[PDB]
Symmetry: D2
Subunit: 468 residues, 4 copies
């Protein structure tokens, strides 16, 4: 039923005690947009400290109930929340494109992860166990992972529904309550999750939503009842690679999610030999990318999050030119054929060549559809030039020589490495966010630890053996 | 061998490239003592930034070698270091008492926990494995825990050799290098570990030692080549009227006077139910007055001296104010003069038992870090749980009651991370299962600490063609 | 909509390729009953060699498809099958009672386990991973748990739907196909599971059902394409003088008369201490005489009929001999005729309590599989432990004492696999944590059972040159 | 100090209560040999039932003690036993060759695994923990892995000390006692382990050794106090695009390590039509260079076969292979070493056969000798059909530079252990194809610990019983 250029927020954007609320006090006022049209979908209040307090006080209450429920009881509520998400998928995914701008194509994948995540932690809640050790003389010791209490989740604008799901699913599975503060850019989708949790059977206050910016964030972090607050990538193309897969990989790595992720492999090192053929093919393919209405099934490139952000990306390209880069295609305002999209935050995906490491476009993360093609001669050279990469990053190597691939992956300091592919998936996702992957056992174990604490009990069955 | 009142440091107290070194740069000077005699066992230089740099740079080099060795190779070196520790146990344990002041009795247990810890991580290094996930079309994904690089370990004075062992073992078993900064109170014992690691086959620079205080610590933390820095209401004891009095008294004494009560672990807030209050107090004072104070090297000694004179003066200060606030000193809390004249200038005091304690009292509010027991009276279960729930998760609590339901009910309500039913153990925070003897570490303790000293690398191998969205 | 004395089987009772089928060949013919009425609900064909072959061949086909689907795809199908089970719960629960005889009360708990179990393995299928080990010089090794192929599941009559689900869900989560062979006593309920799996989205043949007895079982075991066949002193209850009498009596009744006492899990050897013997016996008889015997479909019914006429004749046989051997029948152990004339020919009897029992007695020696309690007197802890430790590990035991030390000491000495302190649960063997309600399964139960239905494939990738010994 | 052609057993060959003992009764008598010389190193008594009973009764006692010790204590004893093994390594390896015939080279690697195994299980004993589940109303449930009791371990002659270590190390880490029956071929080495365990601090009767054959094995299995009894063709696909030298190295390793007397050995060598001639030429060249002789010599890579009947059987297989139409390219004949002490040793030259057919018994049956069967093939589809008749308990090795092909072949192959561009002749028990600096990971021990233990479950009720009635 929902379409581009029509949506307007009618209900309030805060959520406490299982219902939408207007904030009790303000830290300011913000406007949320429809990036495809430039339309204001909401003018909303940012939570003040009294408001922040009410939300924390409310979830503190819900925490006390939820923490007393068994893992099995919590598992059913969470599996239900996933069923509702799965059912209302197209509705949710639409709301997501409307406020964020990503393709319905991508937005659905985001929602798939979202319910998959909930099913994962629901499972873990039901199969939770501690350690038990037998001590000499019938005495024994045991452990239990207890929830922390009221956790704060800070959202991002690039994966709004998915970040909300990803933070709250392990949090609530542990028996905690969450107060979630989404990006002021994207305040809508989180309320859909909040509503779904209530519908699933979560006690009122367990997943609360406070809207706001920096001040709000600070008020949440400064709250005494808050237990815990939960808050360039290279692509090496060797001459011996499968050119078409390398080109496909480069495009995926740079233009998925409009290149508005830090995950994106924007530094494209291409070996001297294949440099000319690669560049020619990459420009050809980029010029075919479908820019338009994110709700259209054929659209692969939507608008950028907002006007300031778009201006910044266009600014990057102006400097890129100034510094000596050769704009091969795009990097300019795109005026879509449909007049409703006239004032949307659109631009054409950019491919830059003749890039050097000293260049700010090579140095800084742009957060837009901009590919920087850097030439290289030898394996030893790339590895020196590319190794300045943080562990929180990803790297991708394209070569038919398996030994070279493993050798390069071994030397690269990036946490996630892809041989003969590239996936633009969020950091949290295990196994580079490959589709039929699963989460394995370690991802959950580690994140469960983040949202819980280990209680240790020692039972003495005999007499105390005094040293004195 | 070594005896009390005779030891003096002869070699330098820093350690780089497998040998003892004098610091290149100076950031002041410190004196280390023999707490049993008051003697200066060392006047040493506090490492300067040029020195800190050398130690980090040396470890960075050693890291590059070690990180390339298999878990199996790393395991043999670590199992060897544990064998040497176990063999030189009394030598180590004695060197520990000489500088720290704890009884040889307790010092040995500390050393047992040190070699046990090394054998544990050695085992984990050899049995390390990642995840391997199969993907559609023959493509696959896998994971690897890699070391972080050069890790900094900051020591404490209460468990000097044990803190050094506890930080270094998980670090070195991940393939990391370590630069260790002991407490300038207890500089000596760490060098013994450093020597042992070299002897075991650790590459030169893998476990380096830099002496110093705050400045030295700051230089280590500020160093760009340092990957990670590992650092270091009051603990209650609830005694119900239905408990086994003798075990409760034994437990209270253990909880307050082990390690001279110089740990934050110690259960110093002793809540006693109104009925048993009089009998408990009478028995606890009787038993406390029997505690053997003296030479920590003596096998019969259960109470040694306090770490230093400023620290002793502070504990004596707390007692002075406690009686000013209205507490009743039942025994001790005064300067003790041992029979032994070599022991004359040692930092000794008689273990203290205080009664008529109120929650408003600073002795009940603040952690003293001395042998001082605060006895607080209570009437009901509901009352204690209110009064004693202002306890942090990083603390420990002990409950004494013959009613099993009550015990579990109390343990459930208490916010402490480690709870003991019908006992109390004063073991460091790091130790799983309340540091009970012959316990083991289970699997989770190691898993969690390995995570602290490592990072997860993920690799995705594509067996087919790239599926383009465009 | 379904009721007692009305139901008759209309469709065939074998399942192949997503539909009910009549067996291709016969190994014989059986009659399935309504135990509450004595009615024949179905006269069915036992599967012959050719039919067993067809089900295996059909499952082999389904296996090839399913095994190629990801754990995530298999997880959705299983989570769906659990949703359908949960939704049609009362329909299945009812159908279960009609053929088996257990109370609708107990039948629901069985069905709750069924869908809980499917949700568990669905979770495990989605989170499956192997090990990845790094080797010198960039070479690597990894592992994967692969399904075995076509597995066979053999049913029991005491938990027909539950044991059907318990065997199918793990085998299928591994990516296997299964051929289930229900007890010829209880053929019906399994077909409901088979139908649900189809409805969920399992490929036709993934979970086939072949009816039959021993010959069908033999044909399944002898089949060359069958990868694995999954099959299905007496349990004591020590009641000490210092315990909580009412909980001990409640526990004794639960332990003996749940599932009409037709489980091997049931704690039928009740050791009672000489002192409390008289009070316990008096209370247990009083409570037993209050047990509601009748229509299993009635919500108030706690005791239904026994599985069949031969089965009942056997239990009453054991009672006849028990009094011949010197036992004192305190209540029941006789043919019961319910007030509802429809239940006139059902397989009913009054729950029995026997006293003055000796270890030499066959009622104490043999498992009866009926509502019969054997009360044995004892004087001391040392005595019981001697008399009761002729217990196999595949059994359960229960101890009632207020002395925690005594409880743990007894549990430690007892050779039973599952021990209950101050309670008793009659849950199937498979169930972790004594089948307590809000328990969960933990991680180990699943790990171990996944290993049963899978095999470890190991792959070694050489990145360098082969190092020849020659 | 020990050498070939000198050793003779002087002490008895059973071990009970921390001592070597002569069997109380007999199930027969066997002769043990020095395969390098043909010498009888021992004429010993096979254990009767009274003797088996004594070993079990003694082990039952030691169990009751060992099972009551902490996993922490057990771990120290086991880490000590590994230190002693590691220290007396050369003595043990020497003794192993003397009775078995394998090279000092391989015999050491066997002993390395042996002490590595013990260190692994020692670690697991110390870090053992059960599950603890919280239940509504303060009630709780927990689990513990308990030992089974007296376990029986049946040895093999190909890895005598290693099989003993591999069975005893997990069982003893659990808290069980073990009665071990070595192969009547290889009695000696197991007693060295039994002695080391005692020296380490194991209670007397915790690891007992009863010498014997089938009757003795049967007596052990039939014993009511015995809790559990633990008991003991592989293809190699060479594609034309492979690295020839690594493929040849791999083929030799796969066929002639341990004198080819393992079921692990990749004896069916499928070679592509194109590289067939170059491969065959190189493999024969390399095989003819293998150093046959005194297993105690550091340069020796091929020792003698386990015994005369076994050698005759392998020579028999070669006779029939050429009768069936195979082309003997080298060896497969009685070898007479230059050293006269070795004159009556059970030696033969490693054999390479070509013109093999799938119908041939040498391709069908496991030979247990140094015999390589070279089979030609044209396409990937063909090999995969011909080689798929492989059991999961087997290994397979693929050699190809095409990574896609390698994974594709490994995926289709039914073998449990697959190697890409290598082949390792390691026992079945070993995780990650028995690669040297591999480790054991965590699953191998978990699964084996389960074999030698049982899960005890305890449920503590903190409240009142909720009666259905």
């Amino acid at each position: 039923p929902m379409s581009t250029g029509t949506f307007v927020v009618s209900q309030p954007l805060n959520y406490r005690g299982g219902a939408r609320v207007e904030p009790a006090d303000a830290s300011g006022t913000e406007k949320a947009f429809e990036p495809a049209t430039g339309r204001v979908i909401a003018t909303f209040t940012c939570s003040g400290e009294k408001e922040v307090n009410l939300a924390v006080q409310n979830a503190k209450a819900a925490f006390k109930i939820w923490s007393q429920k068994s893992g099995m009881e919590r598992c059913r509520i969470l599996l239900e929340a996933a069923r509702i998400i799965r059912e209302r998928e197209d509705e949710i995914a639409t709301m997501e494109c409307i406020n964020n701008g990503k393709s319905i194509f991508e937005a659905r994948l985001d929602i798939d992860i979202s319910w998959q995540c909930l099913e994962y932690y629901a499972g873990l809640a039901a199969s939770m166990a501690g350690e038990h050790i037998q001590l000499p003389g019938g005495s024994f010791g045991y452990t239990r992972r207890e929830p922390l209490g009221v956790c704060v989740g800070i959202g991002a604008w690039n994966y709004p529904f998915q970040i909300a799901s990803w933070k709250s699913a392990p949090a609530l599975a542990c028996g905690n309550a969450m107060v979630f503060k989404p990006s002021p850019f994207t305040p809508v989708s989180a309320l859909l999750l909040a509503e779904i949790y209530s519908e699933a059977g979560v006690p009122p206050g367990l997943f609360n939503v406070v809207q706001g910016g920096a001040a709000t964030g600070q008020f949440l972090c400064q709250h005494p009842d808050v237990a815990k607050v939960s808050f360039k990538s290279p692509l090496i193309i060797f001459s011996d690679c499968d050119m078409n897969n390398a080109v496909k990989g480069a495009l995926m790595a740079n233009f998925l999610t409009q290149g508005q992720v830090c995950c994106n492999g924007t530094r494209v090192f291409v070996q001297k030999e294949i440099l000319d053929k690669f560049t020619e093919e990459v420009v050809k393919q980029t010029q075919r990318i479908k820019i338009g209405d994110p709700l259209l099934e054929d659209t692969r490139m939507g608008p950028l999050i907002n006007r300031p952000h778009l201006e910044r990306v266009l600014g990057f390209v102006k400097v890129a030119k100034e510094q000596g880069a050769k704009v091969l295609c795009g990097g300019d305002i795109y005026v879509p054929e449909d007049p409703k999209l006239k004032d949307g935050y659109y631009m054409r995906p950019c491919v830059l060549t003749n890039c050097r490491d000293d260049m700010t476009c090579v140095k800084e993360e742009i957060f837009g559809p901009v590919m920087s093609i850097l030439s290289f001669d030898t394996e030893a050279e790339v590895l020196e030039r590319a190794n300045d990469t943080t562990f929180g990053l990803a790297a991708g190597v394209f070569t038919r020589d398996i030994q070279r691939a493993h050798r390069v992956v071994a030397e690269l300091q990036a946490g996630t490495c892809f041989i003969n592919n590239y996936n633009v998936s969020p950091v949290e996702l295990p196994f580079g966010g490959y589709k039929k992957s699963g989460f394995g056992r370690e991802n959950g174990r580690v994140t469960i630890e983040y949202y819980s604490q280990l209680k240790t009990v020692c039972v003495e069955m005999g007499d105390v053996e005094s040293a004195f």
